[PDB]
Amino acid sequence: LVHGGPCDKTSHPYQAALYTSGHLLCGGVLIHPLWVLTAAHCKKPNLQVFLGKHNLGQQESSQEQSSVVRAVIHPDYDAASHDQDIMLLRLARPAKLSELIQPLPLERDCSAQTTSCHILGWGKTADGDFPDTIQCAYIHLVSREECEHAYPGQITQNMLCAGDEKYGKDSCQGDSGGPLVCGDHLRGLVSWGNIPCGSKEKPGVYTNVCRYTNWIQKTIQA
Numbered sequence: 001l002v003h004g005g006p007c008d009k010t011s012h013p014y015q016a017a018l019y020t021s022g023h024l025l026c027g028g029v030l031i032h033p034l035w036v037l038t039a040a041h042c043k044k045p046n047l048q049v050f051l052g053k054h055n056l057g058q059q060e061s062s063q064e065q066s067s068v069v070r071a072v073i074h075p076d077y078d079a080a081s082h083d084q085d086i087m088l089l090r091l092a093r094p095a096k097l098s099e100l101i102q103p104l105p106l107e108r109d110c111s112a113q114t115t116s117c118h119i120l121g122w123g124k125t126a127d128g129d130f131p132d133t134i135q136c137a138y139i140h141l142v143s144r145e146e147c148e149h150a151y152p153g154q155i156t157q158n159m160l161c162a163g164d165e166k167y168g169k170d171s172c173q174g175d176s177g178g179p180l181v182c183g184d185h186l187r188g189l190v191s192w193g194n195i196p197c198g199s200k201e202k203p204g205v206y207t208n209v210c211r212y213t214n215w216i217q218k219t220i221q222a
Ligand SMILES: CCOc1cccc(C(=O)Nc2ccc(C(=N)N)cc2)c1O
Pocket: 025, 026, 041, 042, 043, 170, 171, 172, 173, 174, 175, 176, 190, 191, 192, 193, 194, 195, 196, 197, 198, 203, 204, 205
């Protein structure tokens, strides 16, 4: 995450850290004790999910680790365009809830009125390094028309755009699959955007979570 700052220790109980080969790969969102939502392009071998983490460089009393027993990629995910960039991970060990481990409810209304939004993650910062402490930033949803102008022919109905006019606060590599939170609800998942990261003109592109209500519920209940 670029141009942000360290999160408040108690503000992100839904945040998951996804690892492969002992290295951080992606972000994720806890949505049920047994399920974590992430981006479909985060599919890698033997994913290890860490909940209750704030600082990746230290062992924390609140942390809970679990392997993945099932990875469910949306049937219509298109890797080249990032269309339908969503995947459900079933935990081997269900999340033991605490003040620092809680699910985040989903935004089910695609026409939800404008609320305060924020992004978070252990992705690439402004200096180009990967931080040990989770970063946070307030951003705003960008109109579909302005986003279409930024990325001609690339924005689908399964995508949302958000960014920051002032400093270009934006998500980056490592934050993928992490949450775009609007009014204490999951509005989006970090998917793609400007390289190098920065949203002053080209906003961050997020999976439009409201579109996947039926698919998520059908997968969890299957
Ligand atoms: C499975 C690991 O995932 C990745 C691997 C390689 C590259 C990326 C990446 O560049 N992602 C990204 C770019 C821009 C924005 C943005 N500016 N909003 C967000 C994410 C990646 O996620």
